[PDB]
Amino acid sequence: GGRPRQHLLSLTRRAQKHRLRELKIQVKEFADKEEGGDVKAVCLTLFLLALRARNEHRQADELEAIMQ
Amino acid sequence: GGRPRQHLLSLTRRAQKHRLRELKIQVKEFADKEEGGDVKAVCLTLFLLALRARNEHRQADELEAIMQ
DNA sequence: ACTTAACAAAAACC
DNA sequence: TGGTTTTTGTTAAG
DNA sequence: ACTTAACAAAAACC
DNA sequence: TGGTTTTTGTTAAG
Structure with a gap:
């Protein structure tokens, strides 16, 4: 069977990192090829x-206030 | 030649969306296959x-304060 | 710190 | 007991 | 609103 | 003028 997956947001940063591991690579590969390796901005x-x-414009505006 | 690319963060949301178009798809595909289509959480x-x-723990904490 | 991969063990499933 | 996958943390390396 | 794809035109490059 | 790609916005559809 296998242990059921908890929700991503409930996991430790360690386990979260383990689950996105493969998408993190695809994102890295994209940022390098198309955005000059700017993962953060991407x-x-x-x-x-x-x-x-x-x-969710209100939340997006607040994040945009944090990042400047 | 072709027009030089502006920085992603300087572009209109429209043009930003156009540049990430292909990564947006890969992210969608991942979220669907591995995270029950939860793009936001991903x-x-x-x-x-x-x-x-x-x-950048301070910024990460502030975003984590916004999202709850 | 962060990262990475490896080694472990417990946990939750069959 | 066995299997598996997930979760954590530690461990040994950048 | 948002999304999408299409049609346009201007812009910045050759 | 031609080419190209990028940027924007509009347009016509969900």
Whole structure:
């Protein structure tokens, strides 16, 4: 069978890191090939656009206030 | 030749969306296959772990205060 | 610190 | 007991 | 609103 | 003028 997966957000940073391991690589590969290795700006923008795609403008604005 | 790319963070949300278009798909595909289609939690965690990997704990804490 | 991979063991499933 | 996968932490390396 | 793809045109490069 | 790619916005569809 295998142990059931807990929600990503409930996991330790260690276990969270283990689950995204493969996507972290794909993101790295993309950022390198297309955005001059700027993972932060890429993940920041993915997250921002993911928020605004969901109409969470208030949260997106607050994150945009934090990042400057 | 082709027009030089501006920095991702200087672009309009429209143009930003156009550049990440392909990574947005890979992220979608991953979230669906591995995280029950939870793009937000995935991008949130990628960004958080990207911040803490860079020792930007203060910013990561503030984003973690915003998201609850 | 952070990262990484390896070695472990416990946990939760069959 | 056996299996598995997930979760954690430690351990040994950058 | 958001999304998407299409159609446009201007911009910045050759 | 031609080419290209990028940037924007609009347009027509969910």
